[PDB]
């Protein structure tokens, strides 16, 4: 709307002062409008690109939280199993040799160790997925940086006066 007030203003000034007497001002006004329109367009593109990056970052955060919570439950399960296995092994060490209680206990230690081995392989998978999401978030932060550098490149060279003056 500054652009349309300007258009009224210069038109009124020409009505009295004369068109050729205001040529240089008219041309400066034309340049101002063109630069304004170019910046508005870049702002709109910038705002939409940021909106999409925020959505993509949100989506990756959701995946990340999902994995982190999986990792917490894997860590807990594993600690519990290691704890029960250490306790069975303490009991086992205390048996006089010719024992029948060894049978039940070693059976139990075997079955726990199978479960723990499986939980450790799962933990390892979750750790792997969690790092890949982390690195995708890193890619996004760097795409955001490229868009900021892109905007600053445009903004600092958008006018002729900008290029001629230090």
UniProtKB/Swiss-Prot annotation:
Up-regulation conditions: Synthesis of this immunogen is repressed at 30 degrees Celsius and restored at 37 degrees Celsius.
Highest taxon of the lineage: Bacteria
Coiled coil: 31-151
Compartment list: Secreted; Host membrane; Host cell; Host nucleus
Disruption phenotype: Deletion mutant shows fast constitutive secretion and displays increased adhesion to HeLa cells. Mutant is non-hemolytic in the presence of sheep red blood cell (RBC). Mutant displays normal secretons.
Protein family according to the UniProt entry: Belongs to the SctE/SipB/YopB family.
Protein function: Component of the type III secretion system (T3SS), also called injectisome, which is used to inject bacterial effector proteins into eukaryotic host cells. IpaB/SctE and IpaC/SctB are inserted into the host membrane where they form a pore and allow the translocation of effector proteins into the cytosol of target cells. Interaction with IpaD/SctA at needle tips leads to the formation of the MxiH/SctF-IpaD/SctA-IpaB/SctE ternary complex, which is essential for host cell sensing. Required for efficient dissemination. Necessary for lysis of the two cellular membranes that surround bacteria in protrusions during cell-to-cell spread. Is sufficient to induce macrophage apoptosis through activation of the interleukin-1 beta converting enzyme (ICE) in infected macrophages. In epithelial cells, causes cell-cycle arrest by targeting host MAD2L2, an anaphase-promoting complex/cyclosome (APC) inhibitor.
Description of how the protein assembles with itself and partners: The core secretion machinery of the T3SS is composed of approximately 20 different proteins, including cytoplasmic components, a base, an export apparatus and a needle. This subunit is involved in the formation of a pore, called the translocon, in host membrane. Interacts with IpaC/SctB. Interacts with the needle tip protein IpaD/SctA. Interacts with the molecular chaperone IpgC, which prevents premature association with IpaC/SctB within the cytoplasm of Shigella cells and protects IpaB/SctE from proteolysis. Interacts with the host protein ICE in the cytoplasm of infected macrophages.
Domains: entry comment: The immediate N-terminus is needed for recognition by the secretion apparatus and chaperone binding. The N-terminal region is necessary for interaction with IpaD/SctA and the sequential maturation of the T3SS needle tip. The C-terminal half is key to the activities needed for formation of an active translocon and possibly for translocation itself. The extreme C-terminus is required for efficient needle tip binding, and its absence also affects regulation of secretion and adhesion to and possibly invasion of host cells.
Protein name: Type 3 secretion system translocon protein SctE
Source organism of the structure: Shigella flexneri
Stretch of the intact protein here: 74 to 239 of 580
């Amino acid at each position: 709307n500054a652009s349309s007030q300007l258009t009224l203003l210069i038109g009124n000034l020409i009505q009295i002062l004369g068109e050729k007497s205001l040529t240089a001002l008219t041309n400066k006004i034309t340049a101002w409008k063109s630069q304004q329109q170019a910046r508005q367009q870049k702002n709109l593109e910038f705002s939409d690109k940021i909106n999409t990056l925020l959505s993509e970052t949100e989506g990756l955060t959701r995946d990340y939280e999902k994995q982190i919570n999986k990792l917490k439950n894997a860590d807990s399960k594993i600690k519990d199993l290691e704890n029960k296995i250490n306790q069975i092994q303490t009991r086992l060490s205390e048996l006089d040799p010719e024992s029948p209680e060894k049978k039940k206990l070693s059976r139990e230690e075997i079955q726990l160790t199978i479960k723990k081995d499986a939980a450790v392989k799962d933990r390892t998978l979750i750790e792997q997925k969690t790092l890949s999401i982390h690195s995708k978030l890193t890619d996004k932060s760097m795409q955001l940086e490229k868009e900021i550098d892109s905007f600053s490149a445009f903004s600092n060279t958008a006018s002729a006066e900008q290029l001629s003056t230090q």
